[PDB]
Structures are given as C-alpha cells and as structure tokens.
Design a protein around this nucleic acid. Structure first.
Ligand SMILES: [Mg+2]
Ligand SMILES: [Mg+2]
Ligand SMILES: [Mg+2]
Ligand SMILES: [Mg+2]
Ligand SMILES: [Mg+2]
Ligand SMILES: [Mg+2]
Ligand SMILES: [Mg+2]
Ligand SMILES: [Mg+2]
Ligand SMILES: [Mg+2]
Ligand SMILES: [Mg+2]
Ligand SMILES: [Mg+2]
Ligand SMILES: [Mg+2]
Lengths: 95, 92, 85
DNA sequence: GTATTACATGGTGTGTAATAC
DNA sequence: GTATTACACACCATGTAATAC
C-alpha cells in the first residue's frame, strides 16, 4: 500500500538486536561472520546476501526468503525514479 | 501478504504518509519495522519470530493474530487470502 | 529453475526475439542471452525493466532469482552451531 | 572490549565486437 | 533478422588489521 519508509533489513536487525540486548560481536560469533561484516550490514552499507540470509534466519527466525525479500523491496525503493521505463513497451494485448 | 486496510488511524498515518502524531515517539521505528515485516511476509510463519511472540487470537475474532511491540502493547490484524486486512495498535 | 526460463517462455509464446526484447528494455542482446540461459542474475534494476515489458511486479521477478540463489546454496552453509534467540 | 572503516581482493554483471546462422 | 560468448572493465561484498571512544 506504498509504505512511506522502507528500511534496509540490516537496520531493522540492528534495532532488534538493541531490543534483545545482543551486541554486534555476539551476533557475529553466533552467525559465523566477522564483526566488520555485521557492522556494515547493520549500518545498511552492504546488502543482506542470500548466504547471510541463511545464517540470519537460523539466529533470528523467519525464513531466508523473508530476509531477502526485505532487501529486495529496499533495493527497489532506492531504484525508484532512477530508471526511465517510459519508452519500454508492455508486450501483449491490452486488457 | 500485502496490507489492505487499518482500524487504528494512528498506524495508517505512519505507514502511508510517515507521520508520528498517532504513535509513541520511542516506538516509531519499532512499529514501522513490524509493519514492513507484515507487508513483506508471504504467509504467517514468516512472522513467527520469538521477539514477536506471534500467537493467534481465538474464541473472539478467530482468524486474527497478535504480534508484540514492546512490553504489553501489541499489533493486531486479520489474515485472509494470503493478505492482512484490519491493522490495530492496542493492549492484549 | 533460473528466472531466465520463465522469461524465455513469455518471449517464445509472444513471438518476441531476444534482440527485440533487449532493445525494448534498454540492454544489449548479449545481456538478454546470458539472462535467458541462466548464466547471469536477474538484478533489481533488470527486474524494473522486465516488469515494464512483461508485466507482474519487479518484486515477483526478484523473488524468482532469490529462490534460485537459495537453491544453489542448499546444504552449503553449516548453521548447526547457530543459536536461535 | 566494541565498533568502525580503509584497503586489497575476488566474484560477477554488462557492453563491445567477433563468430555463428 | 537471429543468437552466443571472450574480453575488459566497473562495481560491490568480505576479510584483515589499524584505531577512536
Ligand atoms: Mg553499499
Ligand atoms: Mg502491449
Ligand atoms: Mg507484500
Ligand atoms: Mg572508528
Ligand atoms: Mg580508520
Ligand atoms: Mg557482485
Ligand atoms: Mg557494470
Ligand atoms: Mg568496454
Ligand atoms: Mg568467440
Ligand atoms: Mg558454433
Ligand atoms: Mg568474496
Ligand atoms: Mg585479503
């Protein structure tokens, strides 16, 4: 329904970790990645990749697909009005 | 699971135009995240995270579900045809 | 399967060549070829162009690529020692 | 200790242009 | 008119290790 703010999933995770009292360092060791990587993820500087989504789901719940879908909606938001599609024809007959 | 309607005008304001008048200032991002989660999930069960304490609401309004925001306060919604229609912010 | 296969399905059933599809969505035919054959990923920015040409939403197209990425990763990452809070 | 980030690097998407029909 | 692919290139995620608080 056109949500006004679409947050990067890393920033959502960071907020949850604050709410759960879990540090970056503890999160890193649990999910098996370097604190550098966790920092960049949580800051929204880098994407939640498929392989991260597997790890994250195992620690934080829901499915990897869910985590990737958040990242996709986010990627799409940032790309809004950056690609001119006005000249692309919609193949097929009009309903 | 796309969100289609709201009952608590206070949430609709934050989701649609991004205005915090009808929600507590400390809970704005926390609620905005839970809503983005509800709109993104394809099915209940992608909303089953221990922090959410997702449980169905039975006996009265069977088919409605409850997610926790902070301490007592909760977000309540109906689930139908893979979507989430009513959206409310209240207690229990 | 690769989301390439579904696109290829639409193109063949609609009588649209790869070359004309490329020109329509604004990329080189090389790019369409690699996409269709599943050699390269359907990126977010491609998903925007493909939705404009073929319909559905970019989210739909990206979701196919994600399911695919995940299938390739199946049983490759040890999560047995990750604790679920 | 915790978190951040420059740096080097490896992986991968894309256009050009050759090679095919 | 059509498709496929080696090459060069640019971007981005990640690991390492230095560093401010
Ligand atoms: Mg980045
Ligand atoms: Mg048409
Ligand atoms: Mg949705
Ligand atoms: Mg620093
Ligand atoms: Mg520095
Ligand atoms: Mg890449
Ligand atoms: Mg490029
Ligand atoms: Mg070049
Ligand atoms: Mg050749
Ligand atoms: Mg040949
Ligand atoms: Mg790498
Ligand atoms: Mg290195």
């Amino acid at each position: 329904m056109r949500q006004f703010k679409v947050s990067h999933p890393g920033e959502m995770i960071a907020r949850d970790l604050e709410d759960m009292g879990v540090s970056g360092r503890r999160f890193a060791h649990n999910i098996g990645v370097t604190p550098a990587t966790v920092s960049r993820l949580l800051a929204g500087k880098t994407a939640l990749t498929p392989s991260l989504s597997i790890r994250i789901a195992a620690a934080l719940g829901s499915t990897p697909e869910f985590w990737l879908r958040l990242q996709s909606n986010y990627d799409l938001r940032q790309l809004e009005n950056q690609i001119d599609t006005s000249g692309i024809v919609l193949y097929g007959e009009s309903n | 699971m796309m969100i289609k309607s709201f009952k608590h005008k206070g949430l609709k304001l934050l989701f649609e135009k991004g205005v915090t008048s009808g929600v507590p200032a400390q809970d704005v991002d926390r609620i905005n995240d839970r809503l983005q989660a509800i709109d993104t999930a394809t099915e209940i069960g992608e909303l089953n995270r221990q922090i959410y304490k997702l449980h169905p609401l039975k006996g009265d309004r069977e088919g409605y579900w409850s997610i926790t925001v902070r301490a007592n306060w909760r977000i309540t919604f109906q689930f139908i045809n893979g979507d989430a229609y009513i959206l409310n912010y209240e207690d229990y």
